[PDB]
Design a binder for this molecule. Sequence first.
Ligand SMILES: Nc1ncnc2c1ncn2[C@@H]1O[C@H](COP(=O)(O)OP(=O)(O)OP(O)(O)=S)[C@@H](O)[C@H]1O
Ligand SMILES: Nc1ncnc2c1ncn2[C@@H]1O[C@H](COP(=O)(O)OP(=O)(O)O)[C@@H](O)[C@H]1O
Ligand SMILES: [Mg+2]
Lengths: 141, 352, 352, 141, 129
Amino acid sequence: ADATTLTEAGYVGEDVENIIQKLLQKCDYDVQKAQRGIVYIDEIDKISRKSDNPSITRDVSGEGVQQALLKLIEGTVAAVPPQGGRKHPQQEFLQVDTSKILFICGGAFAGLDKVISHRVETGSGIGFGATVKAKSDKASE
Amino acid sequence: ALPTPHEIRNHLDDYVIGQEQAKKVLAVAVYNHYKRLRNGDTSNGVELGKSNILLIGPTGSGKTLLAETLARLLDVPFTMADATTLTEAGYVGEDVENIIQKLLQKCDYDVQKAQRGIVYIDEIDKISRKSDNPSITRDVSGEGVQQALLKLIEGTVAAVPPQGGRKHPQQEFLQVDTSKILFICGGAFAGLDKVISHRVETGSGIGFGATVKAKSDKASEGELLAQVEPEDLIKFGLIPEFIGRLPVVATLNELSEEALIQILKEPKNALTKQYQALFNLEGVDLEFRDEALDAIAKKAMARKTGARGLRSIVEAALLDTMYDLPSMEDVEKVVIDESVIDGQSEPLLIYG
Amino acid sequence: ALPTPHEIRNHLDDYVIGQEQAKKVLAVAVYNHYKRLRNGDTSNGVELGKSNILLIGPTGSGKTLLAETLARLLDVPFTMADATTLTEAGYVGEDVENIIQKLLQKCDYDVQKAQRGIVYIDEIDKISRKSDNPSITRDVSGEGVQQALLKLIEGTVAAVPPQGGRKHPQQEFLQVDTSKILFICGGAFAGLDKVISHRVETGSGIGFGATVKAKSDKASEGELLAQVEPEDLIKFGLIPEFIGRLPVVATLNELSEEALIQILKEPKNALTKQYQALFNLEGVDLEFRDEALDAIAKKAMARKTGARGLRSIVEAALLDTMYDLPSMEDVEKVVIDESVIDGQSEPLLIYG
Amino acid sequence: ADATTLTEAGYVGEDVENIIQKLLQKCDYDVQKAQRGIVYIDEIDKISRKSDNPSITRDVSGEGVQQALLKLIEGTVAAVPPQGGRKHPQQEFLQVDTSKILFICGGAFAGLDKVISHRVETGSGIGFGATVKAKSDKASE
Amino acid sequence: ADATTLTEAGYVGEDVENIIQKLLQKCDYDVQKAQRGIVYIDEIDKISRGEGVQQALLKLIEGTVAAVPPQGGRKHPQQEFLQVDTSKILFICGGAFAGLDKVISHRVETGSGIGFGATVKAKSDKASE
Ligand SMILES: Nc1ncnc2c1ncn2[C@@H]1O[C@H](COP(=O)(O)OP(=O)(O)OP(O)(O)=S)[C@@H](O)[C@H]1O
Ligand SMILES: Nc1ncnc2c1ncn2[C@@H]1O[C@H](COP(=O)(O)OP(=O)(O)O)[C@@H](O)[C@H]1O
Ligand SMILES: [Mg+2]
């Protein structure tokens, strides 16, 4: 899955809970196999929290999406309708625990180098005995 | 029968001490407000006007406490807010219509009864302009908030979203009228005394021919605030159109060491009674000697913490006993004195 | 038959005292507007066009009061708006088209009635450029509001929800043309006198050849406002395109002591009449001596808050009285005189 | 139409494509007639990107409207509501090309004279070699 | 929660109530259980100097009623919104005041830090701290 597509529940974008349902589709909706499955949330950095914008009605993507994903890591059974259940509820709600499901989040955190450097960069001195750092060997990601 | 000012003042006296003048203004205003609501039919041609209150007093003088002590008896919906949070419309901070939203929560989102409610606005001092501002920056936290409140206080229909929503082209709005909704803006106008001190004793000239007959006198900040006039607020930074919406002004004097001692035992919800009841349920009586109360007040004044600091002082003094009292046995009563405050002697424990 | 301007002024002067010039413009505009509605056929080759009004005046001068009094006799729907709430399109603040929605609510969402309705936009001075013509950052709450209103005042096909957004699907936004909708903007332009003074005054210099002007012989606020011109408003912050939509400008002078005295008793809903009825239900009569009213007018002028200052003076005088009045027995009448205004004396209490 | 109400797509304010919607109403939602329609975008001078503004901010009210209108003036297919009823279930996007529609934009540019004067005069200064006119001999607006 | 997250100063009301909403998730969205919950904060020294941020924070500690949606959902009306009083919730505002130790030494110990007689024993032991 990709965090970019994911949005807060009840919105036009997507719902985070369908990730468990997508995993079940691979193993034909069996909880035993699903529990041992692995999840890969690509582009995790794209859902980084952002400040509120007056023009935008609400920030559906951001910390709100991170809370739904965090709930699965804490460990919670997720209700999934099997065999593509009809709109009628019928109380199927297959419970799949998320404590044993491996969660992997892989994203390219562009710009993180800037904040990290500000914290671990000693700086360049000015005196004769100081250490001068040229831009060539300054640092790298 | 509508409660008379004496009855309302008695309730305020139980929880608030040293603000006799403030209680009268709020008590009569609440009584007059009920009369206006009671006279809501208004068979006579005359239309009863609305007068708002402006509580100006130092921090820790019980300005907020007066508002909280009214919700207990107040029949109409009452709520509290903060002016600092409010901001001009069209900005990311906030909007002034949220004040009605908070009031709507208490009234079960019923606009009919909400129109007869009372509102309180805290920290209004932060909204004042500092000085000589060209306004090119388009100040939002300050002057912008005042301009929006003008119509609100005098009375205008306001579009309030249902809940947890921001203004947008959507039709999720509730038309609420603030004509009959009272407003009590309370803030600590720090520095206003200097403005009043200037006008009263500005003097004229410095040289030999000058008139320096006026002599600066040492007066308490509360005493000086009584001489405040609208002209002083204009210099502080408040728009003249805003004061007109608040005709009634009441000032609260600063608390004294003697008053702090009274606050420890006289109030119905006194701090001392809270710890006593905490121990009474366990089965061990608690008593505080007057020797400790005097020392407790001195510590607060010494540290300038005020009435709020009283909680911290009591916590430290009883920290040792509270930790050991539940585990300990055969403790019928505990006696505290001034020796406990300084820490030289542990609180006396009585054994049964 | 349509009411003549004199008849309209008769109703307006009942509640407004001293605003002779304002009443004439409003009465003539209202009378002319009715003629245009009666001329809906428009058989004449020329098509009649509306002229807008701009009511300038200090605080407590009767700007907002005139709008409320006019609605009492307006056959067409009338609504009041707040410029502060309005913001540029695409922002959290309310849009300018919402004003048309409020008018529609009054006439049962009837586009025909709304098209011939009257609109009032209070606090129009708030939406003004803050003396920064470039406007580095978009002033959505300021200059942006004016731009949105530029085409609305002259006429635009506004889009609004059909009936308070019953269901968002199939909106079918109603089309309303504001070409024939009269607009009456009003606000207190604080600081405009400084602009007009610079242009009219000769100026001042420091050298031998310059002309020195004494502080005593200087133009007053009322005097400068009478000489207001469109060029002056442009410097204040308004856009030139905006004034063009408001050809008629009617300024309001500051209320004098004589006018303030009349306001206390002459209008239908005065301060004295308000408190008089307030006490009548309680069973005690209220009598205000003529000398006392004159003293209140002088004290109010010092407050610089306009007519609203009178309410503060009366409340302070009767603050203690109202606090103890209900508990008292058989108080048949109360008398207030000049001795009570300054505070040296206490109001007299007559016992039956 | 007025450019003031228009804003960049994806925001609460009305989109630029709504202009075509207004044109369609005049011809009773006739796509053929709409292609031959004429438009008058008044207040075009108000939608102007502020050259002096914070760099990291999106001027949806300004430049955003200009950018979106680029394809609308040159010619492009724009999706609009189906009809006055605004049927939501039915797709009925009524694709209309804007390649044969004339757009007569108009606005009163305030302050443009001050910009033109900078290029035309080229003589402002304080020294002997500068040109001083006293505003009496300066060119008019 | 962290003070740096809430230093935005824009619509602070929605984030302060968002904290209890996060707490409500753990307690099965039970108002009574949420009131008994313990909330923690850290890095309070950073906001001390935004002054405005402190104005909003004190209200949460003093006690305030915050409306929250009922266990998420697609949408819900103002009536269904759950309101939890924060007066019964325990708030712990943690922090690390590195520079405060110097202020205390100035007030309690000698007010000399540069001269010959001053104490500049910055050995990094920090035992006296
Ligand atoms: N000419 C007047 N005649 C009678 N009462 C008046 C008059 N002017 C003011 N008042 C009283 O003062 C109150 C406030 O007057 P307003 O017209 O609302 O002042 P204002 O022009 O709105 O000032 P702004 O708009 O806040 S700057 C009215 O409700 C009346 O009670
Ligand atoms: N007479 C009093 N009796 C009891 N508490 C008081 C009294 N006066 C002030 N207080 C204390 O003051 C606090 C409220 O004041 P506060 O909210 O700080 O006012 P403001 O916010 O307007 O400065 C309460 O915690 C209350 O205990
Ligand atoms: Mg007004």
